[PDB]
Design a binder for this molecule. Structure first.
Ligand code: X38
Ligand code: ZN
Length: 257
């Protein structure tokens, strides 16, 4: 099916997912000079104090940390959002080298990886309804650069050896996603899509200005994962990122001068 290699990668996706060539696809390059300060943005609220993590899983494309989204235990509101968005999962995209891996870019600069905290609009009842709406999803994106270790990421790193191959999952309760956030909540925002098939144009993207730092050992553990399942030819899970897409009729708004 779809992947990131020469023969099933981003360049091929449009054949099964024609929205791949749509009007509001993600990720994009963030041109800091032409994004516009928007004073009408409300202050962003990331309320993760009751977040209830469940599980960590390797799905053959990335690894997901899934959350109990049956109540408003961990929500995003404010900023460009009108309504309450519930955290359902987070995951990363990363590269084979420290100079690539992020999906969004900033003035064409690529980061070593990118964290995506996925939320869905509670006004639509469940995630599946949300992915049928133009404002059903909000994804908070955070850049990763290589440097000092991120303490809050280490638990994730520790468990990766139990989900090496596609289809493996392990219990992952009591993880606090706040440990993954940079100091500043300054952000750029724009309307776009899922960066993976089915590439649905559902997403209010909120990309933080400040990257977090991770150690080379942490990202290296990322790179030791497998795209394949046990017993299949080993293919290291690296460079699982879609390149920047045309902005088309979209303006990036910024929360900061
Ligand atoms: N815990 C689960 O079981 C997942 C949580 C969602 C997730 O796991 O993500 N789950 C539900 O609970 C649920 C309930 C009802 C229907 C339903 N849909 C089944 C198929 O419907 C098509 C939509 O599915 C797409 C899956 N892809 C993504 O969601 C995704 C998110 C962010 C990015 S990104 N790189 O842009 O940030 C890329 C992809 C689901 C569903 O899938
Ligand atoms: Zn993602």
């Amino acid at each position: 099916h779809w992947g990131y290699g020469k023969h099933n990668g981003p360049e091929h996706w449009h054949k099964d997912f024609p929205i791949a060539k749509g009007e509001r696809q993600s990720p994009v390059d963030i041109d800091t000079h032409t994004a516009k300060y928007d004073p009408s943005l409300k202050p962003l609220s990331v309320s993760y104090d009751q977040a209830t993590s469940l599980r960590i899983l390797n799905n053959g494309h990335a690894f997901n940390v899934e959350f109990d989204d049956s109540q408003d235990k961990a929500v995003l509101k404010g900023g460009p959002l009108d309504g309450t968005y519930r955290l359902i999962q987070f995951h990363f995209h990363w590269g084979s080298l420290d100079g690539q891996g992020s999906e969004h870019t900033v003035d064409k600069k690529k980061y070593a990886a990118e964290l995506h905290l996925v939320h869905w609009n509670t006004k639509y009842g469940d995630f599946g309804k949300a992915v049928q709406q133009p404002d059903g999803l909000a994804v908070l994106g955070i850049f990763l650069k290589v440097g000092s270790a991120k303490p809050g990421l280490q638990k994730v790193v520790d468990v990766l050896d139990s989900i090496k191959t596609k289809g493996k999952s392990a219990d992952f309760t009591n993880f606090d996603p706040r440990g993954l956030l940079p100091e500043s909540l300054d952000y750029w925002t724009y309307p776009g899509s899922l960066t993976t098939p089915p590439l649905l144009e559902c997403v209010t993207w909120i990309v933080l200005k400040e990257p977090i730092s991770v150690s080379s050992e942490q990202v290296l553990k990322f790179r030791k994962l497998n795209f394949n399942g046990e017993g299949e030819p080993e293919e290291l899970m690296v460079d699982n990122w879609r390149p920047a897409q045309p902005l088309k009729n979209r303006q990036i708004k910024a929360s900061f001068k």
